[PDB]
Amino acid sequence: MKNMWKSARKIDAFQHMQHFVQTMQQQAQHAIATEDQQHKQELHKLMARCFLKLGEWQLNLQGINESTIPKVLQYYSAATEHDRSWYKAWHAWAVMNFEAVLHYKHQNQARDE
Ligand SMILES: O=P(O)(O)O[C@H]1[C@H](OP(=O)(O)O)[C@@H](OP(=O)(O)O)[C@H](OP(=O)(O)O)[C@@H](OP(=O)(O)O)[C@H]1OP(=O)(O)O
């Protein structure tokens, strides 16, 4: 999916990743067993990575605006939740809040004009 994102099929990659995250969340909900602890942990890490890629691609395509910020914050909060001990997810979430607040400042300045 990442490769096909790199191969100019960006919107298709984003849609496929939406579907994949939904499917894998359903699988994780269905994955309820004692032996499945390590597999569930790996799947949670994969969900974190998928959500991080979701946010990155959402910014790459739709940019940053009033509509995009809630969705991307949801994606990054989910990514942090699935894998709390991951540096990339937390850094992406924090810098995303940073970008959102700077964008709010800039549009406020535009309003002032
Ligand atoms: O183990 P991978 O499947 O290769 O995933 C990660 C990660 O990939 P994702 O962000 O897509 O999960 C990084 O991001 P990408 O470059 O793959 O987009 C990647 O590279 P960076 O950390 O430099 O972004 C990083 O390391 P690598 O460059 O060696 O692929 C690698 O983690 P690992 O290095 O632990 O395998």
Side-chain angles (χ1 to χ4, degrees):
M1 202 175 317
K2 295 203 297 177
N3 187 5
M4 165 262 287
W5 159 269
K6 283 174 95 78
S7 74
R9 291 188 57 198
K10 297 200 173 187
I11 181 62
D12 291 331
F14 179 59
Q15 188 65 256
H16 283 92
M17 181 95 58
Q18 265 199 41
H19 292 350
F20 184 76
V21 168
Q22 287 298 318
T23 304
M24 182 65 28
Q25 198 77 281
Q26 298 280 68
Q27 193 303 339
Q29 286 170 3
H30 285 184
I32 314 175
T34 296
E35 294 94 349
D36 288 1
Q37 188 274 331
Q38 55 268 33
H39 184 60
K40 166 188 63 39
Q41 176 281 340
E42 300 145 13
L43 294 175
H44 281 318
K45 262 177 181 305
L46 177 56
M47 301 275 317
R49 293 157 80 192
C50 287
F51 272 111
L52 177 55
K53 276 280 152 195
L54 270 167
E56 161 52 17
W57 295 356
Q58 179 82 347
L59 275 295
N60 186 257
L61 303 204
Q62 322 195 345
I64 188 166
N65 54 65
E66 201 46 20
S67 79
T68 55
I69 295 169
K71 285 188 70 55
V72 177
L73 273 295
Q74 158 59 27
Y75 287 154
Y76 286 157
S77 180
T80 62
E81 277 187 343
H82 288 70
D83 194 4
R84 304 280 300 191
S85 75
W86 198 28
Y87 160 66
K88 286 176 70 67
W90 279 107
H91 167 75
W93 183 65
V95 72
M96 164 46 63
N97 285 267
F98 195 90
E99 280 151 359
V101 64
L102 276 295
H103 161 76
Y104 271 45
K105 195 206 291 204
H106 292 357
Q107 63 86 30
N108 177 226
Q109 297 302 267
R111 278 176 171 197
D112 181 39
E113 293 292 328

